[PDB]
């Protein structure tokens, strides 16, 4: 193994549309215990986002079908649909815990105190994956991972409040995902709209395609809400 070849392995996996291999390569790179560059950071986040996103899309499709079949009441179909949905669910949860272990043991741990950008990035990742866990959780564990996602999002938001530009894509994406956490997870839409409009208005005074796209996403979220 060799780190440069591992990064080019992640790039090759991306070009080949094999995001499991991409995530594995970036996980090895992270486990080398050396800090990630901005490009390596984005590679890791994109790989694991695509993996867990395939998982989430499959889970949503099967959950829709499961609600329909539950309304229909056929016992055998319901049994099999539920079993498949839970197989997909456990795959999703395993991916999420892999990401969270990488963040707690390697990525967040190694940032120096002046590395506010990396702190915000990795804490946004932590909140995002705890939210992905909350999307499928019920009962007390749902409250558990909801509290964890809230804590990560809050810490990241207060660091980016102070040490990041209102126009920065990481800050805007953190605000977007935090408002989505308020709306879709806690079901407290007023907090979600207040946060999103606060970010949108802090951005207009200071005005780079990613920032433009994230602001467009914030606006579309506010119109859809």
């Amino acid at each position: 193994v060799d780190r440069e070849q591992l990064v080019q392995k992640a790039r090759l996996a991306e070009q080949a549309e094999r995001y499991d291999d991409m995530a594995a390569a970036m996980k090895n790179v992270t486990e080398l215990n050396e800090p990630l560059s901005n490009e390596e950071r984005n590679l890791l986040s994109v790989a694991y986002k695509n993996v867990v996103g395939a998982r989430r899309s499959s889970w949503r499709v099967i959950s829709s079908i499961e609600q329909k079949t539950s309304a229909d009441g056929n016992e055998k179909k319901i049994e099999m649909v539920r079993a498949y949905r839970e197989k997909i669910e456990k795959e999703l949860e395993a991916v999420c815990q892999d990401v969270l272990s990488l963040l707690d043991n390697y990525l967040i741990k190694n940032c120096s105190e002046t590395q506010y950008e990396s702190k915000v990035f990795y804490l946004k990742m932590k909140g995002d994956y705890y939210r992905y866990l909350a999307e499928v959780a019920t009962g007390e564990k749902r409250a558990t991972v909801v509290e964890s996602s809230e804590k990560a999002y809050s810490e990241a938001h207060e660091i980016s409040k102070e040490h990041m530009q209102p126009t920065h894509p990481i800050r805007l994406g953190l605000a977007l995902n935090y408002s989505v956490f308020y709306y879709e997870i806690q079901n407290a839409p007023e907090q979600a709209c207040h946060l999103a409009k606060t970010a949108f208005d802090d951005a207009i005074a200071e005005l780079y395609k990613d920032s433009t796209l994230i602001m467009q996403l914030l606006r579309d979220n506010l119109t859809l809400w």
Binding site: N177, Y183, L213, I214, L217, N221, W225
Partner: peptide, 6 residues
């Protein structure tokens, strides 16, 4: 509809 994230 589902909200957009990034």
């Amino acid at each position: 509809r589902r909200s957009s994230t990034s």
